[PDB]
């Protein structure tokens, strides 16, 4: 018997990696389909993106089940820790099994394997629940303290084999941190992994000028800089939001999951945007994709905050309630990215020929706006105080 907080943190660290495993193929795709190979490369990329989204949602469902499981339970020991490790091992196969099933939907073997993996996860979770209930001290204080323990003996056991449901705020934060950390550094792993100039390559195709090779690699560095900045600032908005949240309802969990699923695409968006256009006309499409992905990433954080405001009395700290001290600041912080991305996207059509410039200007303005947001909001409130 001991505190289970750390093993849950490790479980979230594993679940973030497993959920975001499937973006690696997407970012390793053929970014430059020269000779107009788009006709097939884009179909392949769409298949990979669909697989990534589906696997992320499935693994997030598994994580939700896991957090509820270790929310009826409230303690740990060697046996529970090892059972949780086994459950985590059985969850890591969901991405591969689902990808195999999607690749071979006709062959029954893929679906059989996916069903076997799901049944295994359920079996290990049922084992965890049974072990926890056989030793009553391991349950959460309420479950063991309550004389209604007999019905709880069946409730979640049946569940393993709704928008007001309180999720674990700490575990939502941990999973979000893991996903943001993975996504922000997603495409520096690529640069470190394969983008170190080989001595022979610089000698032959650059005449021995290392700076020429570094310049050739430059675009990937620009992509990484933009992607890290965007994802880190989205995480900053997320962190500011959850600092003022007292409870996380399942609606907030769903909106957070959508936000993370759409955040996962930012590395691809910036990687495409830095692969400068052979025909500048499609740079408009690249910028549109980047802006729409950023908006989808951030608008769901804003939607989560508003869904929380719907019950702020019980869900949000007083500092952020309607008319609170930091309500206006919170709204500005959460809506800074949606508004900027939407304005840039509109510029892609109404002011198309300057769209790349406006997008690169937004990438520089939004960080400064976040840095100066307190002062800007103070100025805005002073202006709309006499006027």
């Amino acid at each position: 018997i001991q505190c289970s907080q750390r093993m849950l943190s490790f479980s979230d660290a594993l679940l973030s990696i497993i959920a975001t495993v499937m973006i690696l193929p997407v970012t390793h795709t053929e970014i430059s389909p020269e000779q107009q190979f788009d006709r097939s490369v884009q179909r392949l990329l769409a298949t990979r993106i669909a697989v990534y989204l589906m696997t992320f949602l499935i693994v997030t469902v598994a994580w939700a089940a896991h957090t509820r499981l270790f929310q009826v339970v409230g303690k740990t020991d060697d046996t529970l820790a090892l059972l949780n490790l086994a459950c985590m091992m059985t969850i890591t196969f969901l991405p591969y099994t689902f990808s195999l099933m999607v690749t071979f939907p006709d062959v029954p073997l893929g679906i059989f394997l996916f069903c076997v993996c799901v049944i295994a996860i359920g079996v290990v979770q049922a084992l965890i629940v049974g072990y926890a209930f056989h030793f009553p001290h391991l349950l959460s204080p309420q479950i063991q303290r309550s004389a209604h323990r007999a019905l709880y003996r069946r409730h979640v056991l049946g569940i393993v084999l709704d928008l007001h449901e309180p999720l674990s705020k700490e575990r939502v934060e941990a999973f979000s941190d893991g996903v943001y950390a993975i996504v922000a550094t997603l495409l520096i792993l690529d640069i470190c992994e394969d983008n170190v100039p080989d001595p022979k390559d610089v000698k032959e195709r650059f005449s021995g000028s290392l700076v020429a090779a570094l310049s050739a690699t430059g675009p990937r560095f620009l992509a990484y800089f933009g992607s890290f900045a965007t994802v880190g600032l989205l995480w900053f908005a997320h962190h500011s939001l959850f600092l003022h949240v007292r409870k996380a309802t399942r609606a907030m969990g769903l909106l957070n999951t959508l936000s993370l699923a759409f955040v996962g695409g930012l590395p691809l968006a910036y990687q495409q945007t830095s692969a400068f256009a052979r025909q500048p006309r499609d740079e408009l499409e690249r910028v549109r994709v980047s802006c729409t992905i950023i908006f989808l990433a951030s608008i769901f954080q804003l939607a989560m905050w508003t869904t929380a405001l719907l019950h702020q009395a019980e869900t949000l700290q007083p500092s952020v309630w309607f008319g609170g001290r930091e309500h206006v600041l919170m709204f500005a912080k959460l809506a800074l990215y949606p508004c900027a991305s939407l304005l840039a996207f509109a510029s892609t059509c109404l002011l198309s020929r300057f769209s790349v410039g406006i997008f690169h200007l937004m990438q520089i303005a939004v960080p400064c706006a976040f840095l100066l947001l307190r002062l800007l909001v103070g100025l805005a409130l002073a202006t709309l105080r006499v006027l």
Binding site: T307, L309, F345
Partner: peptide, 28 residues
């Protein structure tokens, strides 16, 4: 065409978010 379509979809998303904001405001 499609750029304006998805722009309208995004405008609808922000509109529904604002509607939720105002519903919360009145519920306050």
């Amino acid at each position: 065409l499609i750029p304006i379509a998805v722009g309208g979809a995004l405008a609808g998303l922000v509109l529904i978010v604002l509607i939720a904001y105002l519903v919360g405001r009145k519920r306050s």
